[PDB]
Structure 1
Amino acid sequence: ERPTFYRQELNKTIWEVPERYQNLSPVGSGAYGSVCAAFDTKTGLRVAVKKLSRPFQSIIHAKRTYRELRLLKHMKHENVIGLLDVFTPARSLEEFNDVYLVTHLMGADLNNIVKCQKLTDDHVQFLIYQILRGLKYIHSADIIHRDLKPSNLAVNEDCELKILDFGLARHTDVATRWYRAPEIMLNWMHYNQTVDIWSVGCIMAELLTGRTLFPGTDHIDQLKLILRLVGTPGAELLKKISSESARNYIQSLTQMPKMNFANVFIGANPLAVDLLEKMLVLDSDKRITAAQALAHAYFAQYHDPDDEPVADPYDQSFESRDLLIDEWKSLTYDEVISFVPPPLD
């Protein structure tokens, strides 16, 4: 049953993977692990293999490992990262120290294919459609991404797109704040799912114009540039702000009106402009949802209400728990062992 493993060293780190994975080649890394391209001899497809970095170093790393594995085991949608395989070279819990995750290799992300460049209107429709199709699914399981940015959006040669949990922050050969909802930067501590729609708006704008929509130098500059486009908060939004200091500061600003978006995005498909107007609203309760956005006329050539599925319910109850490092490790180990690969279809 247990496959036979082999060892090699890659960028000062040891990789121990089953023989089925061949021609490991680094493609990059992030805060939580390093990623290699490989050939999967079982399917004949190319895969991405992520080795998590120091998965059980602290209580927080351990819980973060468990969270990532539990999440990735639940995602089963064409526009969301899915797990082909999860393995460890350990034969038992006592020696369990390394965790590797496997997904379909995409080969690029939207940090790249922007090229700092204009994409055509039809390419924008298709890419933003797939993003929203993925988010409808994610949001239906009451998961909010919260950190959407071009690097989270993996794209293959067919322009097929998947949302990653974490992309490559470094590529073996773009500020995150640029894509953040204003409520995130104000530390609201309670979020709507439409925090992610804000980010989509930012990405859609950039693809249509070739320019970063709000290239702030910091969170304060970021908000300054946002208010410039969308205007200062209205009385209706103001009613909903409990924070006295946030309210007092906002009300003390030289008040500004919402710009005419048609003027800002001159030349763009008016349907795209209309959709941008419905994503980029300060008040998160008035932003369009992923489900509503799919049914916007902009996506008429793609929208299929019978092929935009929702997710099985997802149990996030472990988030409220405070466990020992060996308990998170053991729970993660149980998840490695219970893993059922998808069919080769």
Structure 2
Amino acid sequence: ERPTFYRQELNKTIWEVPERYQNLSPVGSGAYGSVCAAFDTKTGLRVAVKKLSRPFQSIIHAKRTYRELRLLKHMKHENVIGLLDVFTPARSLEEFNDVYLVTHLMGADLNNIVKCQKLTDDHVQFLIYQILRGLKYIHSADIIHRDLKPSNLAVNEDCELKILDFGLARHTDDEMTGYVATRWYRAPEIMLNWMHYNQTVDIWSVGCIMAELLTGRTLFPGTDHIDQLKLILRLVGTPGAELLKKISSESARNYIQSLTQMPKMNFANVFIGANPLAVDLLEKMLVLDSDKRITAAQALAHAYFAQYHDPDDEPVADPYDQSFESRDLLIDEWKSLTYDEVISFVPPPLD
């Protein structure tokens, strides 16, 4: 049943992993967790192993660890990060304090691709198709990613794409401040807290990404929140009375009304030389009123993706029980719940 584990110190941290994982080599960084690349001798796959930093330190961390594991165990889709394995060296709940998570090793993110390679319209078609395909899956389980940007999209040498790094923790105010890529892909309602957000925030992010694939350049590289809002409103226009009413914040609504009114720009004169179907799709995604944006399912049927669209191979997710989110528990209760999820994990099959 239980595998044999071996110990190894790598960069001032003790990795204790099953024997199946060999040639552990440190990768990236770790405020969320330390990450090693390894070779999985059971599957034959190169894998990334994450050891969680201080998982049951507070109630908020313990719940976040449970949330991450619940979410990762659910995701079973080609275009979304899947769990290969989850383990602990603990033999009981009483000595449980470390969680390790295993997934397929990724080399390149979409940021590396747009920076370093020239992309044809067919590449943009295929890349955006795959993001939307994964988003249809994610959104069908009532999961909102909340933080789609090129650095959270893993891409291989065949242009095959996966969505990673879900909005699990809140960002700090400081990492959202200034001339930063962490805010450039955020929908303005979430960036400025206009109203209760919903899954359509992710479609805004896809439009920003699509635009950057087409031009090679950030669409809204604001130097701060307000500079970024001005860049957004220059392109899409200032809001009308209908959207203004939906902005629940009185001060945010007051500030918007201080701005000089601007019409929506001609997107064919911004996205010069782009496929007219790409421009049409962008106009449907980069809509200020979140209720009027195209959804992922709607966008997959758009003519831009006619080469790739297959309605029989665009699956939806199994129902995801998210009722834990409204629940208030103790640390040892979240920890016990987390332990049950580690021990009940079944690896995905062979093909």
Shorter chain as denominator, the TM-score bin is over 0.9
Cα RMSD for the two superposed structures: 2.5
2:135 maps to 135
Counterpart CA distance in 2 for 1:274 and 1:153 is 24
Figure out how many residues of one structure are paired with residues of the other and give that number. 344
Contact 1:47 1:104 in 2 (8 A): yes
> Are residues 168 and 133 of structure 1, via their aligned partners in 2, closer, same or farther at CA, if it must alter by over 3 Å?
same
Within the candidate set 218, 222, 226, 2:224 is matched to 218
Counterpart CA distance in 2 for 1:23 and 1:189 is 49
Q: CA deviation at 1:191?
A: 1.5
Contact 1:85 1:341 in 2 (8 A): yes
Contact 1:55 1:62 in 2 (8 A): yes
Within the candidate set 316, 326, 333, 2:339 is matched to 333
Counterpart CA distance in 1 for 2:338 and 2:149 is 28
Higher mean Cα deviation, 219-228 or 185-194?
185-194
Q: CA deviation at 1:170?
A: 18
1:314 maps to 320
> Are residues 201 and 80 of structure 1, via their aligned partners in 2, closer, same or farther at CA, if it must alter by over 3 Å?
same
Contact 2:147 2:167 in 1 (8 A): no
Is 1:48 the counterpart of 2:52 in the alignment? no
Contact 1:109 1:151 in 2 (8 A): yes
> Are residues 249 and 116 of structure 1, via their aligned partners in 2, closer, same or farther at CA, if it must alter by over 3 Å?
farther
Counterpart CA distance in 1 for 2:84 and 2:230 is 43
2:268 maps to 262
Counterpart CA distance in 2 for 1:158 and 1:113 is 12
Contact 2:155 2:161 in 1 (8 A): yes
Counterpart CA distance in 2 for 1:31 and 1:268 is 40
- Give the TM-score normalised by structure 2: 0.94
Q: CA deviation at 1:176?
A: 0.9
Contact 1:152 1:167 in 2 (8 A): no
Counterpart CA distance in 2 for 1:312 and 1:115 is 36
Higher mean Cα deviation, 328-337 or 13-22?
13-22
Q: CA deviation at 1:49?
A: 1.1
Q: CA deviation at 1:169?
A: 14
Q: CA deviation at 1:27?
A: 2.4
The unaligned stretches of length 5 or more in structure 2 are 173-179
- Give the TM-score normalised by structure 1: 0.95
Q: Deviations 1:160-197 (Å, cap 9, x if unpaired)? A: 1111135999999x621011110111224522211000
Contact 2:195 2:246 in 1 (8 A): no
Q: CA deviation at 1:97?
A: 0.8
Contact 2:129 2:305 in 1 (8 A): yes
Counterpart CA distance in 2 for 1:334 and 1:144 is 25
Higher mean Cα deviation, 51-60 or 106-115?
106-115
Q: Percent identity?
A: 100
Equivalent position SS for 1:282: coil
> Are residues 288 and 171 of structure 1, via their aligned partners in 2, closer, same or farther at CA, if it must alter by over 3 Å?
closer
Q: CA deviation at 1:248?
A: 1.6
> Are residues 239 and 139 of structure 1, via their aligned partners in 2, closer, same or farther at CA, if it must alter by over 3 Å?
same
> Are residues 330 and 188 of structure 1, via their aligned partners in 2, closer, same or farther at CA, if it must alter by over 3 Å?
farther
Q: Deviations 1:67-98 (Å, cap 9, x if unpaired)? A: 00001111111101111110011111111111
